[model samples]
Target: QMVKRVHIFDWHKEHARKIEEFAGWEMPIWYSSIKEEHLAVRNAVGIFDVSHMGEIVFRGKDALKFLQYVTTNDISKPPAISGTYTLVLNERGAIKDETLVFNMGNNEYLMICDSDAFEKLYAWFTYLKRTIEQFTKLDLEIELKTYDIAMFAVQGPKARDLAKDLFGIDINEMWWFQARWVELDGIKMLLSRSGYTGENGFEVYIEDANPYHPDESKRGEPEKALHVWERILEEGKKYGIKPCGLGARDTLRLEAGYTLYGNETKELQLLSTDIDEVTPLQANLEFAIYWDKDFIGKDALLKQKERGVGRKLVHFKMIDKGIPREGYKVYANGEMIGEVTSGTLSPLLNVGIGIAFVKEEYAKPGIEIEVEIRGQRKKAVTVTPPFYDPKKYGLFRET
Candidate 1:
């Protein structure tokens, strides 16, 4: 299979120090060093060409109903331009993808999901629609807009100031995940107060033609997307904004203890793996589940809640010198408990931090555990995350 590329592929190829295939797309791993880009976001500002993330749009009178039925969260309450963190689940209550649903109003909704899972998700939704249509008539339209839209995430402590300088909007005043239609030099786009990196930041979406899109007619230089990206760097120079790559993105999200889809959450029943499928109950994502409504995986989740989750997700920091990596064995009480899902040498903390799933009994903060790194058992302790102190970091930081 041919590796896909983002609209900014040319720019990345020309300037990035290293480029690699991620989730089937050629993305920059880092422009300089992962540590440099990671700290740039934590301290000052950084921008990421996240166009590789997938976007799917739903339209028509029954769009909200379809979304509510298919996803774990309540989609009916939010007003237009409000984005809600939600989950798409398989029939067995295992996470298929973690997603953000933006209420675009007028019976239209946009779902942003993990890049690797979008095609599968699109097929899953289509299958569900047909299944539902067999019972009754429904009005809905789903469109894959991943290739047509480009997304950029501008994150950091100085993100609010950049928003004011560029769009003249006070991003701090906007509610979390609340979005507004704005323009940069007359190029209209959507900006949302949301990010994966546990910081005060915003993500912008530009709907320009993608140069690498499969459709010939849609293939053209993404002039507006490139313009917005360059303009952001130019305007953000004073804020010390750097062009971040996927390496930093991974480390940043890990430090924040956010779950990645394929790692922290997945349904692998078909693959016959030793790893058990993860559910919202075990993943600490119960907040997104609306008990009042019926969703695809609600029954299985309810059953699990009653039976108790066998394993649960937890965050930990290394007490020893070794860095933890995914698939490392996690042990407690001198017995194997679970496996590390995401781990990294935290750029901000300058220590090893990771997220893992362990026995339900050993999932809480302050539990002493060990991670097996290259046959050596290294000391670690469970902790609540954003690994940095909240008083000095994260979205609610006091400056």
Candidate 2:
């Protein structure tokens, strides 16, 4: 098999640029202009391949009940054919990872796991099953199928148009955050309204994409379900699509004002040690927390809410030429207030922006602060998230 050379692997061959001076994967930050691509997704249509996000399938009759009981959010609330972008929290109520839950009835559903927490979440679920809690019994017998899934996202204002043109149905007509099986050109697919880019995009699921299928020798009984990858890409290309890797996805999310797991929470981080740091005002994710609903992390979270968050995730702006990357120091009025958890130059705003955990006083929008980008101090400001206007892309009114 030929790997189409991802980053620096095909860097010097395709373009005259030094790929080594880059951070992360040494890949081109943007194939086209970042602002243009960002606006394209907002104004018209922009396509992203996004194959890097992880996928996992959960099976068994008790799967829905088991899954809802485990995750932090209330999964039982999403409609039957609908989907939701929710989080899975640990016993202490600290978020493990944010995932999209597609409840494909009959006690069966597909779970798209966060890449960083794939192994840890799987192991945690296993541990829960072994324990003698209500969800886990020695003999009730539940099967957990946690594994990789081939994932893709096609987004923007024209996303529904593309889907209608390609699949003969309008995705906007489907229930929000719901999953419906749509067979496009004889290929079975799981389509949903969940996406990470803060735009109206669909996440599609394909099963058993491994090269070796279980029934490979069955005289072409269609082999297994792994061949859907080619069809998804081929059909998706008619809508001015761009193959989106994780790098673009990250920048896209930052502009949307969302926090990453390691950057925002941990056993050592806010929700783990002092969960109160993220009170309703500072972190602004209270809507995601369910106080009335019973969940794995609910009780502890309620107690924490009663107390208040000690440390919080805040927004900081870059005022100097130097960009503030992750781990930069945040200063309030000449005092070291907090540290930058995740920072980057805005792909849309053409300025520096980031999410950081900091003192509550310095976390509000318009609050002035200093970010130590390098050896020098740079002026910065606290601002609201969605650095890009979220509504620009994906026609969302009554759709």
Candidate 3:
């Protein structure tokens, strides 16, 4: 007998370009072009086929209690109808995985996390439920199921306007983190304003069916929720949506103040069977941290806070360069200071920009450093993030 595999993205064939990772996932790292997609979101609208991201469902009378014990955010206070981006950690305080936990309803949540950290986090939940909470008996088996959920983004200054009109849903009233059931031509979906692009955008999830064409899948019968990609493109067309690939998706994200799991962020703590250095505090993600009650990594996080982190991630604009990519050496003067974890040329700024975790001595605006782009140390300077926050996200200022 032969084994079957899963497929995620659909409508990939319609695009002019696609990049497939060794892991067998196909992505449109670019289409209509990288620079084009990069600019479109800033000026108009950019659509992304991010359907490849994975999902895990947590349930139990104690599901919220389980997440409260694991995640860094104040699980009690996620925006009423939206979602929050937070980290799931071990007891030690390291980042286990970054997850988008949508407060789908009162006690139910749909968490979207990186594919690399799924199994470990899933096991961590099960383990904590057993051994850690031993002595004190909390009964019954927790019903946890991992499923494939496909999602995509509609982004830019005009993204909400275009999306609202196209989907015929008043997402403008939805606000950040708030999502509602939306339908496009009868396909019910979950659309929210959370994106890796770091722009005003919406990530829509569709899971009633798979989005892939199993017949053409080299991976065999498509994974579940593969229908998201086709539906995204089909309804998103009127909004000037583009089928963006991972290449552009990444560049766009890095430019827009987002971090990459394995690239900009280390996946080891996440990769290591069970560790906590991947804590929420290490990532400085307090926005999602609900400080009301102590969670797993809280003490460890407080200790780090008292000791202060030696280095932190920040954005830098290259003064001159070969393009800076991940794992590039970053140095201050003649001494090696840090490393550029992710980088890309800012189309709007017309300058190369990237993120790096540099020492405190090198953490100042206008601080100069060098990025070894293919062994050549390129000059660069630290700068504010969002790299281009002209409109102030419109969240702060009325537009």
Candidate 4:
């Protein structure tokens, strides 16, 4: 049997200027140019076929309790109509994955997580479910299911405007990180005011009836993802919405101080099954963790906090001419201070920027550092994230 692919895969293959393999799916890395698409997202509107991102559904009587125990964020403060960003962690407090949990009513939730780690996340959730049920004596009836859904992201300054007009839905009234049901030409879909890029954006999830299920022959047909794509492209012709790819997506995220799973949050390679390589505090993700709530990793995080962390992730920008790539050795006063976890040469700023874990004392802004890029120690300085501010990027400023 062959692996299932994005419903709109063939359409993208025909239109994309550059395509590459990503997480077992053929995806476009760029359409015209990396720089061109990167700026298009910043200045105008850009659409992305992010359908490869996985979806896991949790439901039944104990679903809310299970999510509360597993995720870092407190689910007690319900959204009723939107969603919240959270993290599932190993008991040791290291991040397993960052997720967005949407309130789908009827004691159900749809968790959207990274594409590559779908299996791992599912496995982890299963383990947590069994362990929590057995030890806690909480007879919380819960069930987990994976669904086949094609997702799209429309991002930029003008993204909301374009989406509002195209879909005939007033997405502007939707609060940040909120999600609601939407329909286009009689096709119902789930749309959210969320994105990886640090810009105004929306992510749409379209379901395929039964792409895969336990019942083999009863599986349903593909979705109208290609139709949705074409319609958006047609309507967006006046809005300058270009088809964007993963290359620009990555650069835009890095510039926005968003962490990649294998980069800033977790290890590139998991050396051990039991360890907390990085905590939410070290990752500067204190905002995501609700200390009031009791979670699987609460004890470990509490301990780490009491004792304090040795090193923490900090943002930096190149002071001289050089690009700071990952694994680059960061030094201060000729002594190694840290290693760059993620880095990129910014298109908007035209300067090299990075996030690295360094000695706690050295994580402060104005701290001078050097990145050994290709054995040439280049001057760099720590600064508060994100690399681009509202003054330049207009990411959070009213336009």
Cα RMSD to the true fold for all candidates: 1.8, 5.4, 4.2, 2.9
> lDDT tens string, model 1, 1-399?
767888878998998999987767889999999999998988999999999899999998989988998899989877898989999988878899999999998989999999989999999998888888999988998999999999999999999999999999999899998999999999999999999888899999999888889787889989999999999999999999999999999998998889998899887764643233788898999999989999987888888877888899999999998899999999999899999998999988888999988999999999999999998999999999879888888787899
The whole-model C-alpha lDDT of candidate 4 against the native structure comes to: 0.80
Candidate 3, position 28, lDDT:
50
Model 3 / residue 279 / CA error / Å: 4.9
Residue 201 C-alpha lDDT in model 2: 68
Question: Pairing residues by index, what is the TM-score of model 1?
Answer: 0.97
Pairs with backbone N, CA or C atoms under 3 Å apart (clashes), candidate 1:
none
Write model 4 residue lDDT over 1-399, tens digit each, in one string: 345456676776788799877666668888888788889889988999887776888877788888988899977565766788898888788888888888888777888888776778888887777877776665444343344677889988888788888777766688887888888887888889888888888988887644444346746655567677778888877888899988889989988888888788873333663336687878888888888879877787788788887789989999988999899999997799999998888988898998998988898999899999887999999997777776656458556
Model 3: CA > 4 A from native: 1-10, 22-24, 132-147, 211-238, 267-282, 392-399
- Report the candidate with higher lDDT, 1 versus 2: 1
Which candidate has the highest TM-score of all? 1
* Root mean square deviation (Cα) for candidate 1: 1.8
Q: Could you estimate the TM-score for every candidate? A: 0.97, 0.80, 0.84, 0.91
In the range 150-222, model 3's lDDT, one tens digit per residue, is: 5667777667776766577665576677788877666677888766776677877766334342333322434
Window of ten residues with lowest summed lDDT in model 3: 1-10
Candidate 2 vs. true structure, TM-score: 0.80
Model 4 stretches with alpha carbons more than 4 Å out: 1-4, 131-147, 209-223, 267-275
Clashes by residue pair, model 4:
none
- Go through the candidates in order and give each one's C-alpha lDDT: 0.91, 0.61, 0.66, 0.80
Instruction: Name the 10 consecutive residues with the lowest summed lDDT in model 1.
Output: 268-277
